[PDB]
Write a protein that binds this ligand. Structure first.
Ligand SMILES: [Zn+2]
Length: 277
């Protein structure tokens, strides 16, 4: 029979789909709209995890509530935190007390994670190494093209206009790779809401910098960024909500936004369209 691969975030499931295709059974625990920072594994999830031959998760403490679940499963199956293969020097350190887990927004950096998915699959099914390698090389070429595309789109926007404010601070790697100044209403983790103070400071930032738009996300209730937009207006500045971005989760299955390449493409197109003119 075919082995079972269980993944957390959809971005990782996307890599498994492209590299392993039908050679493995794939179960993604977190679908569209799911916040990985706040996610608690259900009993059904733990069942799937307990039957998996390979478990792939992000690491870098993204899945803040699943550490123990993963801990207890090592020793009986391959468990790989794909993003922990990214060199420490390339990770963004938060006040020397945590690493930013949103590595998928620097496409070149994400190639390390994709390589880990590919290599883990080869360990799982060594007999499939050749086809996995062909599919992986094709997928990596798509990612190379995606990186170049995002960079062109970013460069098409005036430097002064490259200021991105979103529902939470998920674009730190995007900021470094593509030349954007970024701020989020909630922090790198969504574990805590933004305080009244945090909101006034960001509202002041938005008003003083005279930004054209701010963005909502598919995994955080729109209510908060909408309340933020209101605070900005009470400060004499009119900012609009430029669109909804995919931060921690991808779009629906069947749509291009339900793929890693489509998710990123949607984000850059949406951002550039709202920030331009
Ligand atoms: Zn996040």
């Amino acid at each position: 029979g075919k082995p079972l691969v269980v993944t957390t975030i959809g971005m990782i499931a996307d890599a498994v789909k492209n590299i392993a295709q039908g050679d493995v059974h794939l179960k993604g625990l977190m679908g569209p709209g799911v916040d990985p920072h706040l996610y608690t594994a259900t009993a059904g999830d733990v069942e799937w995890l307990g039957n998996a031959d390979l478990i792939l998760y992000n690491g870098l403490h993204l899945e803040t509530k699943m550490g123990e679940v993963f801990s207890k499963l090592r020793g009986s199956r391959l468990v790989v935190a794909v993003s922990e293969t990214i060199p420490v020097s390339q990770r963004l350190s938060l006040e020397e007390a945590e690493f930013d887990p949103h590595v998928w927004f620097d496409v070149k950096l994400w190639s390390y994670s994709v390589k880990a998915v590919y290599e883990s699959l080869c360990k799982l099914l060594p007999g499939k190494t050749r086809e996995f390698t062909q599919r992986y090389q094709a997928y990596q070429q798509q990612l190379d093209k995606l990186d170049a595309y995002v960079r062109r789109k970013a460069q098409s926007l005036p430097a002064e206009r490259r200021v991105l404010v979103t529902a939470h601070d998920a674009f730190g790697y995007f900021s470094r790779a593509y030349g954007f100044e970024v701020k989020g209403l909630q922090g790198v983790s969504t574990a805590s809401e933004a305080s009244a103070h945090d909101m006034q400071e960001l509202a002041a930032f938005i008003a003083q910098r005279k930004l054209p738009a701010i963005f909502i996300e598919s995994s955080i209730p729109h209510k908060n960024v909408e309340a933020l937009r209101d605070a900005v207006q009470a400060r004499g500045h009119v900012v609009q909500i430029g669109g909804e971005l995919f931060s921690d989760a991808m779009g629906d299955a069947g749509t291009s936004e339900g793929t890693y390449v489509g998710m990123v493409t949607h984000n850059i197109d949406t951002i550039v369209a709202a920030l331009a003119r």
